[PDB]
Ligand SMILES: *[C@@H]1O[C@H](CO)[C@@H](O)[C@H](O)[C@H]1NC(C)=O
């Protein structure tokens with residue numbers, strides 16, 4: 252319990268229910284690296300689904316019940332044993348309380364029951380951190396898992412530009428998107444988009460952006476143009492437009508991807524049709540990562556990675572994620588490094604064909 256809660260001093264930057272948003276902080280004064288981690292936790296795209304999320308997932312919509320401290324785990328750990336990558340860095344955990352994939356900039360009003368301000372939350376956290384040491388940082392790594400991973404892709408360049416416009420050109424802004432690299436593919440079996448689970452990837456974001464007034468990166472916006480900004484929530488479409496360095500971590504068989512595709516791998520037989528579907532999904536994911544030079548994509552069926560305590564255990568081609576991220580750091584001090592790889596994408600075609608996949 253090393254990270255201390257700070258509620259945002261600008262109380263107009265709010266969680267869904269209007270309570271102040273905020274962040275958890277552990278300073279490391281002998282370090283110029285800052286890690287800002289964006290929590291995940293799905294989203295809600297209408298008043299009905301958000302009302303239900305407020306009833307039984309309230310911490311994802313309100314700061315009123317947040318604990319005063321948080322323990323940093325995984326890449327947020329300060330223990331070298333647990334975090335061989337960035338154990339000495341300044342650590343920031345930003346709770347997800349906007350249900351908007353970190354894309355909203357809409358104040359709650361007489362007209363709107365809920366505020367969706369995820370993008371403004373990130374900007375306001377960054378602004379208040381400047382006075383707490385971030386002003387002297389050498390690297391600001393914006394990281395996130397699941398909806399937070401998509402949040403990284405939607406916000407990393409805005410953070411970069413915010414810091415330039417504020418007068419801090421020296422801070423190198425980078426992104427680490429964990430489990431937020433999704434495919435807008437066809438479902439294995441069609442379900443009507445009623446809720447977050449039974450909703451096709453494409454339909455979910457289309458309703459979402461409208462409901463949150465979601466904003467997306469400018470260059471991507473300008474490619475897909477008006478009405479079609481939902482495209483920018485899918486990594487393989489928004490990533491090529493990003494200016495900042497972004498490392499992508501993505502299971503080939505992400506449980507949340509399989510959920511929105513209406514696939515449930517129990518322990519019972521999988522018939523030819525499901526086998527084909529699952530193998531094609533892994534192949535398409537690989538294809539989208541071919542031109543992402545810094546990436547870690549193991550052939551596993553799993554949910555999320557980088558803040559779990561044993562994130563160090565998985566390897567692709569003999570390299571762990573902490574090592575790959577270290578190599579990525581070195582690559583940014585183009586031409587590949589001897590024995591320090593950064594592009595690590597499994598090629599085998601079925602869940603757990605990588606023996607180091609998390610086991611449960
Ligand atoms: C506080 O946040 C609100 C909400 O976006 C914004 O309109 C205002 O400019 C902010 N004030 C300061 C001083 O940053």
Ligand SMILES: Cc1cc(C(=O)O)c(C)n1CC1CC1
Pocket residue numbers: 291292293294352397398399401433451452453455456484507508511
């Ligand atoms: C943007 C996002 C966050 C999550 C999540 O599980 O947090 C998922 C699945 N997406 C993709 C959306 C099309 C369905």
